[PDB]
From Swiss-Prot, chain A:
Keywords: Ribonucleoprotein, Ribosomal protein, RNA-binding, rRNA-binding. One of its GO terms (cellular component) is cytosolic large ribosomal subunit. It comes from the Archaea. It comes from Pyrococcus furiosus (strain ATCC 43587 / DSM 3638 / JCM 8422 / Vc1). Part of the 50S ribosomal subunit. Forms a bridge to the 30S subunit in the 70S ribosome. One of the primary rRNA binding proteins. Required for association of the 30S and 50S subunits to form the 70S ribosome, for tRNA binding and peptide bond formation. It has been suggested to have peptidyltransferase activity; this is somewhat controversial. Makes several contacts with the 16S rRNA in the 70S ribosome. This is Large ribosomal subunit protein uL2. Residues 222-239 have a biased composition (Basic residues). Residues 1-21, 203-239 are annotated as: Disordered. Belongs to the universal ribosomal protein uL2 family. The keyword rRNA-binding applies. GO terms for molecular function: rRNA binding; structural constituent of ribosome. GO terms for biological process: cytoplasmic translation.
Swiss-Prot record, chain B:
It holds the Pfam family Ribosomal_L44. This is Large ribosomal subunit protein eL42. One of its GO terms (cellular component) is ribonucleoprotein complex. A zinc finger (C4-type) spans 11-74. Transmembrane segments: none annotated. Belongs to the eukaryotic ribosomal protein eL42 family. Binds to the 23S rRNA. InterPro entries: Ribosomal_eL44 (IPR000552), Ribosomal_LSU_eL42 (IPR053708), Ribosomal_zn-bd (IPR011332). It comes from the Archaea.
Amino acid sequence: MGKSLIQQRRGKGSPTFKSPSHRFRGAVKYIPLNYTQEKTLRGVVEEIMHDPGRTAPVARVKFENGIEKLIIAPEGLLVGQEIYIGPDAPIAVGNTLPLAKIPEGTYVYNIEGIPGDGGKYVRAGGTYALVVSREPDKVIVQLPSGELKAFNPMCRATIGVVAGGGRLEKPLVKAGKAYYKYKARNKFWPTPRGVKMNAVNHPFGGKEHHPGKPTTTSRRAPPGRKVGHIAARRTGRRK
Amino acid sequence: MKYPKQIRTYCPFCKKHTIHKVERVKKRPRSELSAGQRRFRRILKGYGGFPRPKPEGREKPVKKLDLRFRCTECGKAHTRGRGFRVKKFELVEG
RNA sequence: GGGGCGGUAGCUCAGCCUGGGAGAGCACCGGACUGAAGAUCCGGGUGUCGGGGGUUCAAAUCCCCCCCGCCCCACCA
RNA sequence: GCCGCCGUAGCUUAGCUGGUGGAGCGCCGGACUGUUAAUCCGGCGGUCCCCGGUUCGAAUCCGGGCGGCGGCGCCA
RNA sequence: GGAGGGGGAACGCGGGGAAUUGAAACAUCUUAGUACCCGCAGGAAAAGAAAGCAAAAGCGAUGCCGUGAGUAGGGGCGAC
RNA sequence: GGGGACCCUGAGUACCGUCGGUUGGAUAUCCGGCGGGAAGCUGGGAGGCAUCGGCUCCCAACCCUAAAUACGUCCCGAGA
RNA sequence: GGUUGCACCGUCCGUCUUGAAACACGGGGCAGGGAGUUCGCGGCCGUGGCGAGGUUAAGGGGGUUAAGCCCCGUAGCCGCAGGGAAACCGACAUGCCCGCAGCCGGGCUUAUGCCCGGUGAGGGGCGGGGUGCGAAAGCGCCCGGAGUCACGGCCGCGAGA
RNA sequence: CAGUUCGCUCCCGUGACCCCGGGCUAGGGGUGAAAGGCCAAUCGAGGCCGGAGAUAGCUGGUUCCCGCCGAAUCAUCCCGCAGGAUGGCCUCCCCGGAGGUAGGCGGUGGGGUAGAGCACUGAUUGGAGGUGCAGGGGGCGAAAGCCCCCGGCCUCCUGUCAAACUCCGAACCCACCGCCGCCGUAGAUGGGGGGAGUAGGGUGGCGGUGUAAGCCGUCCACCGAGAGGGGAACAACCCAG
RNA sequence: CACAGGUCCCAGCUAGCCCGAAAGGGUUUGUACUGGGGCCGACGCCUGCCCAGUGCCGGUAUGUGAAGCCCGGGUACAACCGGGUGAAGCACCGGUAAACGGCGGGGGUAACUAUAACCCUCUUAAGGUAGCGAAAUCCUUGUCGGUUAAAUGCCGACCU
RNA sequence: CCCGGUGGGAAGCGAAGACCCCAUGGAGCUUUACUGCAGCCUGCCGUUGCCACACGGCGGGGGGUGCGCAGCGUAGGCGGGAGGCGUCGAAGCCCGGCCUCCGGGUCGGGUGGAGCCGUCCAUGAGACACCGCCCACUCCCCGCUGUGUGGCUAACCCCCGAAAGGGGGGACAGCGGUAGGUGGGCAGUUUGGCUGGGGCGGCACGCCUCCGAAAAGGUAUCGGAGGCGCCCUAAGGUCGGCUCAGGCGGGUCAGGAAUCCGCCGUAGAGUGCAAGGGCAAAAGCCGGCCUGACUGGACCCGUAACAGAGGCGGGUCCAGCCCCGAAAGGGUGGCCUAGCGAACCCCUGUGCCUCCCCGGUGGGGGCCAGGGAUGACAGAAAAGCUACCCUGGGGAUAACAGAGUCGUCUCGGGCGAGAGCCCAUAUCGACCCCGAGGCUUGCUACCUCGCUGUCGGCUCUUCCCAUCCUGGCCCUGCAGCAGGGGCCAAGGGUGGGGGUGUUCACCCAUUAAAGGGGAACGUGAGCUGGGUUUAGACCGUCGUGAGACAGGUCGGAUGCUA
């Protein structure tokens, strides 16, 4: 039977399906070796750049212990804004403090999930997490999906929103302009359909336009057969 | 068909006539116990060979007759050729 | 073949473990009720309650042998 | 030309182990109604398509026939 | 201060391990521990002084050759 | 040489249970893996199922081993 | 003997095929090369030694330049008794009758040869026997000494065959 | 010219464009604006080497001569009918040993095909005479009425003919015996052992199917594998071995 | 074919999906305006109806469901036999068609001849809706019309 | 002989034909084919620790609780047992705790202060006389052990840090091992044979009958008719008695039935079931008895003639044990012919051998027989697509063309019912019958599958007449002019356009007339290449899907120096 599929290639880390890492810009680090408690730490926005692979703008920050690292840029930032990191950071936009120290009902981004791992949550253009409720036990934060995850209160986060909103408000326009974007990122394209792909190429669909077996697939289905609507609970838009 | 529960017929053992009693054979289970259990070894990963055995039959529009004929007096049974084909075998009461 | 469940009054079943002459609603016949019709009440009965045999004075369900359907397995030299 | 399957009250349809026969519809006679419709009681006709056969008896199970329904009529 | 690696005509020892084919199909079986692959040693290797053998009698390390014997035994109990 | 406890006498081993690989190895091959797990010679294993008794043999879990047996690089001798 | 004229007859070759001169397939021509082979095992055959036994293999002595042959080794295989799955049991170096060859007798043809009576190895047919199944009976298989080894070849199977 | 070329014409020609060099991804893998395309004159799974002298019931070929005999192309079984095995048949060697019986006559048996027909099983054609009766039409119908009437159900002399009918039944085939013939003691007849070969054709007869040619049986001279002579030639007609 | 646009689906990152014998790895210097997978294929107007069957999903008292362990029996031990305990899985319930797909037959009836707006019947979940249609419709060169002197064409129309 | 030209032939060269079939060939692809294998889910064991809680199962004691129905009354069961109880302190009053069927019993406080019970009998079974052990639900301290939930942190894992150390989570998870489930993601394979080539379809693939079947025997086809894959323990066995369908006459009835009496009546009945064969003092019918459809072991035949051949069946003996019948004698199943099943495996049943020094026990092996399947029936374990194909071959076999044939097709002849105004035959002509051709279709498989290139068109040329015109003629329902019908005749002529890929055919306008057919369905080593039947694609239908279609449709190369 047929060849490995379009997704199975991806997993190899072969180069058509390898992100560039040499035209791409820094990652967020908050650094916990100078700790949150017994803070020492303010910095100055050294410059602001666009990061290609995040599809969002990012800030270089010059810290006052002498380390240079990027922090994902908030809206309404100036070059020469001071950003502080600690709990004794002011409670204002672009300032970074623990969740407990942040009020309830304020918008927040760049939230830690393990204390001191530098931001692994809410680091996309224009989207933001809401602090709905806070208790000394656990602080519950409401995620971009509408969905509530419980985090440790001693996670760090930055007050405000991410910059680079309206991102999908503007369209991509044409196949050319789009081609241009995908080179900037990594996303296998032009991507055709399995339906007129031969029986070898793809599990569903033959020579001509019509599906083989149902599109909807198991949650225990094999690798290389898990294409379509993956483990769909519902489909359509009707009763 | 309907067959008498008891019927007078030849006993090999007594070598003399007596009234015999009719029953009906019955399937034992397997499982220790056999060349076929000894066959359970064979089936390592991959196929058995034999231990893969049929894929389905079946089951012949009739049945054959399957009986035991027991001497009343000694109590010991003797078997006869079956192949006397019968749909159904019913024993009556006396 | 193994295990389990259901086969009951014309119908659908209820009463396993929770035992008796024993059941309920609906069809069906009769009587109330309204100007009318219907629905809704009140009577009537149709199975010792799947066969055959056993323990019990009395057993649907208990016991020994079962027909049939049903579901899960095992199995066909 | 092949291979399945029908015909059942005037119509349309249930049904059959061979001992049977209905429903809805039309129609007919009464009855509400002023008349009528609707509604409401009372009914009936069926060789259960033709024609053989087996049986004690076939609407039913086999033979054949007739009209109506699907499926092949082709890689050659 | 002393060593290692790599090579070597075949052989040797230890690991990984098919299929065409045969069974006139073929899956168990067969090819076969073969082909092919890895590690490694020598001039021979390995085995080697019984927790053996089992004609129950009789023997006292181990290779190898003849033979046992195409025997016992395995196996769609078929082919082998 | 005989006199008392005879010297203690090898562990994840022996053995058991579960899955393979392999073999001719059959219940009775060997080797691994997974789980369990002895004995102090006042003992243990072996004799082709298990267990109990007699009977006969022999000491695993430490180590080495010449020679006789493979080859054809090389030399010589040989040719239905 | 070469060549050619004349008379008469003749549609290659090989293969496929029921039928090929073929409008079936193959071949320019010539030269060379080119296909039933080896081992094991079984079943046959001919031939040779030995003899109820027969043959060594492996081996080392010996001899030789080497080596074969010589003589020595007898392990093992098959045969000499069979039947039965096994337990386990265990048979005719002959009792009876035909008769081929030959021998013996008579008759007959010139002879070879022939017709008829005994005797008849070899052979043929009974009986009695062993064992297995079997209460028994009745069959199955076997029974009054010939094989082993050697050499060539035919043929089967496994092997590229 | 070229194992993918040439000219005219034609599309694109600031772009999702073209191009160079470096560098990445390798065979059930990659890569694919996805054609089963492409991955070095090789792609619906590259090439090289090995397994490997794979195996094929399948095509081709298989080589000195002479002498003697000389086929079957059928049957049963078979995941078998383009093949095997085992018989018939062909051929070779050995054994025992007195008969063997292709031909013809008679005797004693077997038989339902040709033909023929009403004798059955029993299909069917046609009209008289019985008026023996089960019923669809009419009548005096005073009403299944007394009485006749017309499809008709079945006797009779008659009337058509009948794979799977038969009162019958040839020619003819076949069993056994006797006889004669023939054949054998230069060993037949029978027994054992070794070696094969299992596509048929074809006229005629008798068919079965089929408008037919053809198919498929059967016996058949013959061809296969057999010349020569004749039919103009002409596989199988005639003559001839 | 891509394509911009549209939609369905999955995942809280110690994820989902995918590669790898293994260690480990791609996405990822990535974090839901992400990034992964399908379907459809610019715009304009729209996208009916069905969960019966297939598929997916969530759940499951009950039945059922292995090895293990347990208990009973057996065996001086063991094989073994029987029952409970029996997870996912199955039966079972619900959702779900911009998931795969489906989207029917006869009869009778109107001033008059026509048809049937109309009315019966039944399968099997539902019964073809907006549209468009003799088509990139068999019969067939339908028929009518345009167009040609003359057109098995084309086009427009009807449309069963 | 040579040159030049064009290519008609050399079935010219380039091909071991892609079409088709066959082969127990191969490959790719598909799936709810067969069987395996990754991944995923999931239980268990190890990794694997501490507190509690709740909770399942033992295991020891214990502790309330028992309306069959009579009824003194709520009899739970047998058995010892009609007497036990009472200063070894009783009724009977007053409450307290109590479960519960609130049926009513149990029970601690106390007043008391000396009796209470059944034998008796009812009750299907008798004692709240007492004594034992139980079987009910049920509840609980303690001893063991599972399971579920939460807390903890010391293993282990994810983050940070060169390190030191800390953060998140925690016996979860992860990893090792194993079990079950899902699982074309992956891999190996198969998917039969018969056959007017092949496929659907059918199966004539096992077996039975008559016929075909040629008067012995054999004997084929997708050869005619038409069955069996069970039924029966009497539908067997034996014995005695007995004779039938149907028709007639008398009887009853509307008729008729069952029933009745007599007479005829060689087989039309019956004998399970096809067919055929057998049979009348029976094998049929009826009745009784009985169970041989028994055990063992043969011969022979069939199977499979002759003639090797397994399984299976049968006749026919003899021994043993019964049965029946008076006996003779019969019975090896059903009067005969269909009702058929292997090696191996397992289970059954009996008796007997055997299991590695030896005995005993368990559990084995084996001899024998019966039963359980292979209906594709002398037995593999088994789905599809391929126009992406590939190979070995075959004209043993399809498409194309030819040959053969000639149902069809074309044409022609005879007879002449009947109509045409009377008038068969000017003309028209049914029923039926007979020929010729080879021009349509079909049949065939002879030739060809190591390729004789398809159609149509174009271009170029020959031939045939059964003649469309032309010429020469006959008849007429021939007035003319114009027809209808027939004869001779191929010398010549027989066109141009519109649609269609079109040979054919449809239409237009002309024309004297605008005839038909053959030449590899003339003509591709001449052109053209639109169509048919490649590989791209779409729609409809079908199909789970791959994928298919003589359905519709766009596109899709035309080699060679004689």
